[PDB]
């Protein structure tokens, strides 16, 4: 039966490399969101019975590792518009793929929310008694997108994502640096996956350590059309744009931090 | 004394390769079930005193790694009829070993339940006061097999295992792909073990993330003969066939997902 | 100042290899017990405030990895009389070092208890109000040695350690097998450290997953002389000999299990 | 745009190697403190809702791994004056960089506290109602620096840090030993990161497993100027000097322990 599989492989073969990389980013971000947002639903819908916040940190951290193992060889497994912006800002990848990856990263993250919604369709609907509440004691929209806590304000929420994304790029840039290799080559999947693991355990209290415009805006746009309504965007004094603008500004901020102390003074 | 050991080794040497691989699968699935179902008994019989659900996720995830380290070099450490079905569907392994591995995977998983039952013989019997209850406040059958929760329905339970198994095959296929190696070769034990770790932390709320017909039907058949009675099969509106049919359909579904976006468009 | 260090190194150089390996086993078991029994004191004296049972599993599992990294190159990091008995039974190491390693493993484990006692000297004494209680609500002897639970009986306690040690040897033998290498060579520290991690999360409910005569009898003998009295040995219907006799019988039982299915039918 | 980046790289290039290593230590300790002290604020300000003590252990343990991945190739990622003192005492690194690294390690740790303070500015101020309390039910100074518990005394606190640092150097020396390599070269980031993980789970109950004069005195000096006042230094019967003097004495104590049993008797 290998003759049919090889025949199907040659027909479905994609000549365009750019579209091949965008297809890998859709599945790479799908795994990250399905295994990440699905973990939140496991600890929110169960009210902590099936795990606490450490379950979210372990699943979100190791979902990046698995997403890198899946789409790393094809597209580089950027998995983040802030990460893609950092690579483009460093003259490492063409600027033409910045909107291509972002469009391919928002998708898949949007699809990953639909998979999580279909995975917990009965639990989500029975959480608030055949109704959808954006936030509160029976809030269900917090599973997909990230929302500020009661203590968090508008100014602190901006710097919460800025520091989270800057610390992500600083650690990511050191891993992907060709001249900075304190670890044998090929272990970039586990090392980058540890960065998201310690970010959730350190800066995941204010909002939910989004630090990813695709991971946040993607499922947030899904919840608007799924039935949560327009209240998703207006929650937290129009919080929806904070996990988008701030991580982009945090990427260039984290690019400068690494380059000024270690990146430029190497070799 | 090495002369006797070498003499015993040559006598016990098995010429048939297929039977050698089936013998490895029996011990490979035995370790997976003994260390997996034993973890559930540690957190169910102790009522959360000796660990929560994160204990189950860590033990189930790392039991696959140890089972791969034990039987990986001999049989490939399929450890799953859905995984074996995916390999056969991809023209990677002969179809003759699909029933051979499944028979060898149900066994060992059945034996692994007996080892767990003998490990917690006093705790299981004293859990309900010298009696066996399939489900409820003193339910003991949920340690071995997986049962749906109160919120889970018949339709959602089918798609809960379908999504769990499809996400397992997608991540497994990327690891075992000869042309998709973002990680140095030989680390397949740890990478696959992380897939089960994040599946339990993401989709382990609805039923218990079976995603393995051998890991579910094996000990479930043990509980029927151990003393739990025929109520094990009739619990949850005849739930016993869901962790069997759905993961098989989820394997081919997950095979298509990986091949269409990354698998076919490689090299 | 390197001249003095090199001069001191040549003077202190040990010609005897057997005594060099015994010295490594004393420090190897010291790290395992200090980081293992110290973890129990962190969650028992704090009444779960500074960690649950998962803290014990992670610390005990990763203490074996660090002890292997410290004494692996010198003595092989057996760290267990049952493991040493398995190697001697397999004609891999001389029988002369079976009592030498056991004497060197009981020591260090005894010293590791003294370090833990001095680490938590104030917490241990203030736990019961300037008194030492072997077991109960204010029990402090359970930190060092392992004691059966209320549900555990004499017969089940024997098979609890037998299954725990047999599963340890089966996974250890597959790692140290020269012809069974599904993982790149040199990762034996992390792979063996995962075996103890999943044993604590699976079979650590009945008694405390001793599965190590040196790790159990060592600090238990320390508690008798530290002030706990002879009640340590008579607790649990003379439980002290169960974590000694059973793991030794479980090592040869686990040796046969691996050899009959995978060990003999290799290459 | 690569022409501008290369032009900027040559201008910003640093000729002095010693200043290049000090710049790496500032960012290396910054990551360790930002991801370490930020984890404490995640579990203290949330009152355990967003994680327990295991969150601190995982974040502190893996922050050393990420800090080594960032500054390991440049300065060696000492990250600890006790570690730097151990290297200088072993005639491995020049004594001239002992005050240079310590000054560069206190900084960054001081800056890491400011980043954590700005990350949780609203949560810290709202924790005690627009006020700063050093210790108590609303204590906020314990996030940055380490303070003794109620049971801990002056004598035990000295030996709590002595044992913690000695066990750290013993495990660190075995990893960085050129002649003691039971693990493939290059995995020093993960192996050292496991040492801090098991130290927090074993000896992190008495004070908070400081075992690092830079990680403790750095943010402690920040809290004095941030608004906590001079009570930070006088808390716990002048505890501030214990995490400074004791780890330095524990480094040479741990140097002797490893050298006498394994270090000297090698090759």
Curated annotation (Swiss-Prot), chains A, B, C, D:
A motif (NPA 1) lies at residues 80-82. The record marks 60, 209, 215 as: Selectivity filter. It is found in: Cell membrane; Basolateral cell membrane. GO terms for cellular component: basolateral plasma membrane; cell-cell junction; cytoplasm; plasma membrane. Disulfide bonds: none annotated. It catalyses: glycerol(in) = glycerol(out); H2O(in) = H2O(out); urea(in) = urea(out); H2O2(out) = H2O2(in). Pfam families: MIP. GO terms for biological process: cellular response to hypoxia; establishment of localization in cell; glycerol transmembrane transport; odontogenesis; polyol transmembrane transport; positive regulation of immune system process; renal water absorption; response to ischemia. PROSITE patterns: MIP. Aquaporins contain two tandem repeats each containing three membrane-spanning domains and a pore-forming loop with the signature motif Asn-Pro-Ala (NPA). This is Aquaporin-3. It comes from Rattus norvegicus.
């Amino acid at each position: 039966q290998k003759e049919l599989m090889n025949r199907c492989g040659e027909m479905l073969h994609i000549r365009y490399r750019l579209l091949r990389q965008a297809l890998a980013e859709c599945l790479g971000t799908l795994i990250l969101v399905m295994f990440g947002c699905g973990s939140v639903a496991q600890v929110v819908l169960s009210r902590g019975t099936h795990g606490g916040f450490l379950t979210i940190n372990l699943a979100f951290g190791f979902a990046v590792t698995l997403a890198i193992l899946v789409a790393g060889q094809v597209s580089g497994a950027h998995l983040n518009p802030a990460v893609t912006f950092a690579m483009c800002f460093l003259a490492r990848e063409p600027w033409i793929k910045l909107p291509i990856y972002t469009l391919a990263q928002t998708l898949g993250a949007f699809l990953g929310a639909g998979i999580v919604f279909g995975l917990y369709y009965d639990a989500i609907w029975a959480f608030a008694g055949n109704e959808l509440v954006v936030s509160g004691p029976n809030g269900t929209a917090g599973i997909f997108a990230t929302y500020p806590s009661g203590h968090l304000d508008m100014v602190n929420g901006f710097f919460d994502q800025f520091i989270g994304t800057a610390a992500l790029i600083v650690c990511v840039l050191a891993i992907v640096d060709p001249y900075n290799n304190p670890v044998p080559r090929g272990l970039e999947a586990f090392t980058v996956g540890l960065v998201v693991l310690v970010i959730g355990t350190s800066m995941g209290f204010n909002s939910g350590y989004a630090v990813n415009p695709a991971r946040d805006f993607g499922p947030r746009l899904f919840t608007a059309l799924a039935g949560w309504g327009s209240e998703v965007f207006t929650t937290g004094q129009n919080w929806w744009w904070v996990p988008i603008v701030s991580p982009l500004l945090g990427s260039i901020g984290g690019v400068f931090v690494y380059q000024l102390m270690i990146g430029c003074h190497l070799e």
